[PDB]
Design a protein around this ligand. Structure first.
Ligand SMILES: Nc1nc2c(ncn2[C@H]2C[C@H](O)[C@@H](COP(=O)(O)NP(=O)(O)OP(=O)(O)O)O2)c(=O)[nH]1
Ligand SMILES: [Mg+2]
Ligand SMILES: [Mg+2]
Length: 430
DNA sequence: TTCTGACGCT
DNA sequence: AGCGTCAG
């Protein structure tokens, strides 16, 4: 008991933009605002593949990974914005730039770890300590938490969503004020106050809305964030974990949504995260390996030690294009022209990266898929990246992959290529 | 018929 | 180094 760590040492938040690419397009084009709308890549095949969906369109059942022609069947008035196309491929530049706008605001409050194009973890532990001392013992008003939910409340002894939110918040604050709650619970609450401030700054300065999770570690903060989207933030306390996890499907937890999560369910014969507490650490290590076993044992108790890494900028810069079915590249000339198109986009992005961020990539990774392979990559080869030159890069990439071609004729490529990917990696200060 | 990007294993 | 997993 007294020596058992509870993982309540940090305050961590996860901030994630609401329907991010849609808001970027809605900021630019006011005709799209407050409408069912979606962002697609390409257009010819089935109207384009949807990658982002406004909450209004979600109500009609429109989702990511849906073809726009199918989406239009559920939502006839669906409005569509198309990703920019350059050199015959999708160009995500506008969204990466919007992302930087948001990340730079977040970094004013605390150290952040970019987790994707539209989300970052925040380590608020230090910021909270400072705000606590400033207060002098002052109680925390509900007015400071106008968009916060407390997961698990209200409980015990209104029929509208906002009323339920407030009743939960009141129960929580009443407990802190009394002194019923822990120091950790106070720290989380102050963390939520700062997170309100951060989300207000993002909205004021970019126009974009986001949601957030506040908890003691990255896994819980990420889980919390999704509980009340859009435009809300959720506090998940250590105390809330047993009830929360008791009916939480294992797949909902970050990293368990794939094959490992399926094996946990299958091997142990359980469904919910909370059921993991029955097993000893050694039992879990036996089935899932020393690292996974230790992580699972702690995680199902709400505990996780993964640090928020001080990293705002992506570690790699890459671009890729699929060539599905009949579009598969079947000639040497085709392969070279597309390697050049990818190389040109990469050069432009690398050159900008070097001016903005004082660094240079030193390795070029080339990846391809051959027709008939399920694997995202069939083959990956690296070479030196010594100069930001698209012609040189595309020539080098061709050099490293040319041996894969089995075709007896120099001009033909076999098997035909279904994917090309060029990635710049191994950055060094410049 | 998507286009990324982080990280683990060997 | 090259391959796989995971999350969108
Ligand atoms: N190229 C590409 N971009 C994608 C893909 N999937 C998502 N994106 C892009 C488009 C997304 O806007 C963005 C952020 O990813 P989320 O936060 O997972 N989705 P969102 O913020 O839209 O909604 P909410 O968080 O409120 O549910 O990444 C994809 O498969 N391919
Ligand atoms: Mg998002
Ligand atoms: Mg996201």
């Amino acid at each position: 008991g007294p020596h058992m760590a509870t993982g309540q040492d940090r305050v961590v938040a996860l901030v994630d933009m609401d329907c991010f690419f849609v808001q970027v397009e809605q900021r630019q084009n006011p005709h799209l605002r407050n409408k069912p709308c979606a962002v697609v890549q390409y257009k010819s095949w089935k109207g384009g593949g949807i990658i982002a969906v406004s909450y209004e369109a979600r109500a009609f059942g429109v989702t990511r990974s849906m073809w726009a022609d199918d989406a239009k069947k559920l939502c006839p008035d669906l409005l569509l914005a198309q990703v920019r196309e350059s050199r015959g491929k999708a160009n995500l530049t506008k969204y990466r730039e919007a992302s930087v706008e948001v990340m730079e605001i977040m970094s004013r409050f605390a150290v952040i770890e970019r987790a994707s194009i539209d989300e970052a973890y925040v380590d608020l532990t230090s910021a909270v300590q400072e705000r606590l001392q400033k207060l002098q013992g002052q109680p925390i008003s509900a007015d400071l938490l106008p968009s916060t939910y407390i997961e698990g409340l209200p409980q015990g002894p209104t029929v509208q969503k906002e009323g339920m939110r407030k009743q939960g918040l009141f129960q929580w604050l009443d407990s802190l004020q009394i002194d019923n709650l822990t120091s950790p619970d106070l720290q989380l609450t102050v963390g939520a106050v700062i997170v309100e401030e951060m989300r207000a700054a993002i909205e004021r300065e970019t126009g974009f809305q986001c949601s957030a999770g506040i908890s003691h570690n990255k896994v819980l903060a990420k889980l919390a964030c999704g509980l009340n989207k859009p435009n809300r933030q959720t506090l998940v306390s250590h105390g809330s974990v047993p009830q929360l996890f008791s009916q939480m499907p294992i797949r909902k937890i970050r990293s368990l949504g794939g094959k490992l999560g399926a094996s946990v369910i299958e091997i142990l014969g359980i469904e919910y995260m909370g059921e993991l507490t029955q097993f000893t650490e050694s039992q879990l290590q036996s089935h899932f390996g020393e690292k996974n076993g230790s992580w699972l044992y702690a995680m199902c108790r709400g505990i996780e030690h993964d640090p928020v890494k001080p990293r705002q900028l992506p570690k790699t810069i890459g671009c890729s294009k699929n060539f599905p079915g009949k579009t598969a590249l079947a000639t040497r000339e085709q392969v070279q022209w597309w390697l050049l198109q990818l190389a040109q986009e990469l050069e432009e992005r690398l050159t900008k990266d070097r001016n903005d961020n004082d660094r240079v990539a030193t390795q070029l990774v080339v990846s391809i898929r051959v027709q008939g392979d399920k694997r995202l990559s069939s083959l990956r080869r690296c070479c030196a990246l010594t100069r930001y030159d698209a012609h040189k890069m595309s020539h080098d990439a061709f050099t490293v992959i040319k041996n894969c071609n089995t075709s007896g004729i120099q001009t033909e490529w076999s098997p035909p290529l279904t994917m090309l990917f060029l990635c710049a990696t191994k950055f060094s200060a410049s």
